[PDB]
């Protein structure tokens, strides 16, 4: 198909004890697969709509496409943004580190803003550190669901899934503990690479 | 001076009779100007929040940022996507044209899908032709307001403002006439340029 | 059909000079009629879905129903909430007046909160004075489009349409002047009646 | 003390094995409690705004009010809509039953439409059976989050929480099993009571 489910770059239990393998399996094998399948279906439906010149369901198809594709993009980024603690360094280094100090003042400032954005979401959503092509800067955005509350052209660098399915089985309603534990498995090397390729657009 | 109001690449009345000069003036000078100020203000507010370590209004600020920055991005592309009748080819050619035929079957099919997405919006929004970096293809998206119903990483190639302020003074409630008339001023050279640079991401 | 387009309780030009007859005609005859037709169509589609046991388009149909029915409800209330200046009294009287002083402090306080809610909307929307059945109080709500940002059970008492089609032809981008002029045509007798029948639920 | 957390009309484990006591406890004690506090806080904030004549955060406060108050309303109806298996009739009777057959053809048709609306939600939301005062009929609505996709004046009769926290601990990703199991604890006497009082509006 057009979209395919990427494999995890590590074992399902590699992120423990911070993130359980039980969540990783359901999150990847079930939820992410669903978005991939939904994005492919939306495209097939759009294709049939053009062939028959019937765009009656255009509003539905465009939302299906945006919702599912955004879900695929967000999760694909999410998997690579993590790595077992000890494998990747903590705290941004070199160019990324400097850029963070430039646009946020310091790493602690960025972390606090990102955390506030993650825990304050009213509904399902994401906390996202993106590259703004227009302002040539790094900003934090609070996505609603998967596809709402973000400017076009935004390039994701670091994302934290705040949908309840991402943490409920282990942290229950305490989203704060989930965010705190998550900081331990952030793969700053992946975010650094994304930043390198992002700022050239 | 992080965000600035770009000047129109043509005179306010250069798009007539398709889009009146009265609309171009109010649209650029008043509306677009507002989103630039709002985007700048949101960043200043976020910087103040970090300085005082008070992220109590993070939800408001993240939406102020997304809404205004997206408005700024969308209108910035919109102005360049247009040019006086006779300035550029009335139909895509070369790689852009071949890509359109590849992802939509034909130029007419693309126009039909884009038009349906533009006229069907339930509320304020945009019809948008974007480059999908993940699927490596061109898709049409239907934005709600300025910042909703789109995947992160979407590169805008061609956009049509469907907010009522974009056409009400001239076309009133007849959205169909506005869209049909708009096709006459589309600058395919701009779109082709955006496509060339998008594919290299 | 199930839903019908209500006739205006006054001539199209009765609200002048505050609201032009040109806007009243388009707003009522075109925009409102569209919501009535759309709500009826949504119900017919839902009926067919049940007959054939095909709920594939349920997400589309539920949004179509909510969007259009909310549009019908909001506009129906909107027409009755207005009357030619001099016909209806200015400032709430008796029970309504007391309730407003109780839940807002004073009439000026309510008017200021309502005005701020009306002019600050980021996209299409409504400023609404509703009766809260659960808290047994009058609150101001800011609707997005027609059907978003409101609790179920909310009973509208006074509504102000902030969609651009409601004021653009006369006030252009200056929504502030539109709200200020609108206060002159509010039919406080209609709001009083709605309040009388609302607080018994 | 404007908004208060209602107590469950039954023990936390009274709905087992359909809905676990663990979920009922967290759902009522933690989640519902949060919306009550948020709704109270929003009103206090709005009162403070009026006192100081500063409505700068009106957009944030109106959403805080709508989101939290709607969460409060939705969960308040939800608890009462349920009762231990064997407490009430497993199928609507009398006027409620006749009304369901009138507006949906049959009870099974209603269940099918309600179920489709519940399982198809793209994000957090609610499946809801409401009384439409304008059309004088019973419709099914699909709420997004707590406060989106619904017309003002909608009277909630029966509601099903589709937020992940409502079923993830027990049913994981299998939404279909949660909905099917939920039908077994629906208190039709409560719904019938709400219908009787709704029709008298
Ligand atoms: Mn997820
Ligand atoms: Mn515009
Ligand atoms: Mn209107
Ligand atoms: Mn809940």
Curated annotation (Swiss-Prot), chains A, B, C, D:
InterPro entries: Fe/Mn_Superoxide_Dismutase, Mn/Fe_SOD, Mn/Fe_SOD_BS, Mn/Fe_SOD_C, Mn/Fe_SOD_N, Mn/Fe_SOD_N_sf, SOD_C_sf. Its cofactor is Mn(2+); Fe(3+). Binds 1 Mn(2+) or Fe(3+) ion per subunit. Keywords: Iron, Manganese, Metal-binding, Oxidoreductase. Mn(2+) binds at residues 27, 75, 161, 165. Its EC number is 1.15.1.1. Belongs to the iron/manganese superoxide dismutase family. Destroys superoxide anion radicals which are normally produced within the cells and which are toxic to biological systems. Catalyzes the dismutation of superoxide anion radicals into O2 and H2O2 by successive reduction and oxidation of the transition metal ion at the active site. This is Superoxide dismutase [Mn/Fe]. The gene is sodA.
């Amino acid at each position: 198909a057009v979209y395919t489910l990427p494999e995890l770059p590590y074992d399902y239990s590699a992120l423990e004890p911070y993130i359980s393998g039980e969540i990783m399996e359901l999150h990847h094998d079930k939820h992410h697969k669903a978005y991939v399948d939904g994005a492919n279906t939306a495209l097939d439906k759009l294709a049939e709509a053009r062939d028959k010149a019937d765009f009656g369901a255009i509003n539905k198809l465009e939302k299906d496409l945006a919702f599912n594709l955004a879900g695929h993009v967000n999760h694909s980024v999410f998997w690579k943004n993590m790595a077992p603690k000890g494998s990747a360094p903590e705290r941004p280094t070199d160019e990324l580190g400097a850029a963070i100090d430039e646009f946020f003042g310091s790493f602690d400032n960025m972390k606090a803003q990102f955390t506030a954005a993650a825990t304050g979401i009213q509904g399902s959503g994401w906390a996202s550190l993106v590259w703004d092509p227009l302002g040539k800067r790094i900003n934090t955005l609070q996505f609603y669901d998967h596809q709402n509350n973000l400017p076009a052209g935004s390039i994701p660098l670091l994302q934290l899934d705040m949908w309840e399915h991402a943490f409920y089985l282990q942290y229950k309603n305490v989203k704060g503990d989930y965010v705190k534990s998550w900081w331990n498995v952030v793969n700053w090397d992946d975010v650094a690479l994304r930043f390198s390729e992002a700022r050239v657009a």
